[PDB]
């Protein structure tokens with residue numbers, strides 16, 4: 001059982017490089033529009049406290065240099081949707097997949113294609129944390145890299161990368177340019193809310209462990225949903241809803257372990273610790289696999 | 300630091316399916332040749348005790364169904380090289396990347412594109428263990444999925460998947476069909492040997508921690524390579540080769556910590572433990588990041 005990303009080829013064919021003045025970052029080229037973070041327009045002075053509408057009205061199409069590989073795409077119009085710039089180009093991307101823009105909820109996972117200078121560098125799986133950050137791997141020039149899920153040849157874009165917080169976690173927007181979380185695209189100190197652990201995902205991962213032949217953490221105890229939630233909240237875990245219990249149904253039926261029996265296992269893990277043992281090679285409880293992720297990989 | 304795969308697009312464009320009889324696995328289409336595991340020619344009875352030369356002599360080009368999606372590629376020749384079948388087809392793949400076939404060493408990492416019926420399913424990073432197995436994630440029909448690294452648009456193919464051992468780890472060949480390790484492509488009792496920890500990768504991880512300011516474990520001692528190797532083996536760690544010392548060169552130069560001084564630091568951790576301290580937020584020493592992986596993620 002590995003952390004597994006979606007194949008990235010459908011997204012690689014959409015990545016381009018966008019340069020405005022001194023700043024170069026990545027854009028997403030779909031049909032005849034390039035989407036990118038609007039902070040590309042800022043100078044190093046503007047970026048400390050930008051007035052974006054005032055800055056954008058002062059730009060011309062020719063201020064934007066868009067490069068797909070070696071070929072320059074001519075920008076023929078530009079507008080702003082929240083924190084995302086939409087550059088209209090005179091060329092349609094023949095590699096445009098079937099796609100949708102979606103806003104994901106905390107606890108959902110997605111694949112990130114990290115890119116620099118319009119060229120894909122790496123792919124990995126992330127979860128939207130309950131505090132609306134992501135624990136990514138992004139360096140200078142990674143902005144405009146996107147996160148996505150793939151469902152039968154349809155790419156659902158859910159994240160565009162904008163910034164790194166002082167704690168090393170990351171923040172960005174949906175493809176409508178709205179940030180996940182209380183963050184802003186301004187270079188100034190910003191912290192996130194206290195994070196919590198994605199309970200339904202920890203349980204899904206415990207089931208993945210059982211599917212892969214590990215049972216050391218199970219016990220013979222039971223719990224009610226409410227009593228489990230009291231202990232979960234005490235340990236800074238998210239509430240488990242009846243919808244979550246239902247979503248875990250396939251995994252419970254495959255292993256024969258009732259959801260509330262798995263909750264009693266997790267409760268014991270939280271109260272006693274792992275005593276130096278590991279689950280699926282991990283010394284900590286892993287919360288970045290959803291129930292769907294486990295099913296997709298295990299079957 | 301997290302496991303980051305290479306973008307899979309250049310490999311996705313080379314994946315096809317190969318069917319003999321009712322058995323379908325994956326193949327790799329480069330120029331006008333498709334490479335796949337030779338056990339595609341076996342029936343469920345043959346696999347228990349196959350005579351591959353006799354099975355191949357009964358086959359003709361017209362017994363092999365090669366498909367890119369649902370589009371058939373006409374087979375015009377077939378031959379066996381070690382444990383791989385090479386099917387010459389009448390069409391050169393226009394998506395063939397610049398590529399090399401390489402045989403990797405234990406400890407080296409690579410990205411796996413897990414595929415079923417020629418359709419990519421997911422991508423993840425793997426390390427070749429010292430016992431010549433990988434801790435993959437593979438289901439029925441995954442054989443012919445490949446592992447690869449990418450360097451300046453050149454894809455180095457290093458692994459093709461063949462089998463799962465009873466401990467749940469995986470075994471396969473290079474693209475010339477030579478197995479890694481003592482395994483054979485027959486359904487008969489086989490077992491992975493005892494494994495060891497990849498010392499060169501643990502050292503790379505310690506350098507990564509130093510780069511990020513986590514350096515409490517740096518001591519005031521040094522060691523010789525030979526003395527270190529003899530101690531490491533007593534802790535079930537791999538000895539270092541001269542090539543390992545050289546691949547740590549860039550990280551040693553970046554940090555100013557001599558390789559042998561870092562070896563002495565690791566020796567102290569092995570002999571006295573970590574004393575409840577963590578390194579990079581972990582109580583365990585990670586051994587599946589190579590020196591290149593550490594550099595790749597900070598560059």
Ligand SMILES: CC(C)(C)[C@H](NC(=O)C(F)(F)F)C(=O)N1C[C@H]2[C@@H]([C@H]1C(=O)N[C@H](C=N)C[C@@H]1CCNC1=O)C2(C)C
Nearest residue numbers: 039138140141142143162163164165185187188189190
């Ligand atoms: C890291 C930092 C001090 C720079 C700053 N953060 C804060 O100012 C904070 F305190 F608000 F977080 C920050 O990220 N930015 C400052 C400026 C943009 C963003 C930015 O440079 N984005 C990079 C896109 N190419 C990706 C970054 C680079 C390092 N790793 C990444 O992921 C905007 C918020 C408008």
Ligand SMILES: CC(C)(C)[C@H](NC(=O)C(F)(F)F)C(=O)N1C[C@H]2[C@@H]([C@H]1C(=O)N[C@H](C=N)C[C@@H]1CCNC1=O)C2(C)C
Nearest residue numbers: 338437439440441442461462463464484485486487489
């Ligand atoms: C695991 C199994 C008990 C079935 C068996 N293993 C052993 O015989 C061993 F133990 F010896 F290794 C293994 O038999 N196979 C039998 C036959 C091929 C191989 C096989 O089915 N390969 C699959 C390719 N599509 C990938 C597998 C499927 C499950 N997960 C995988 O990765 C060959 C060795 C010729």
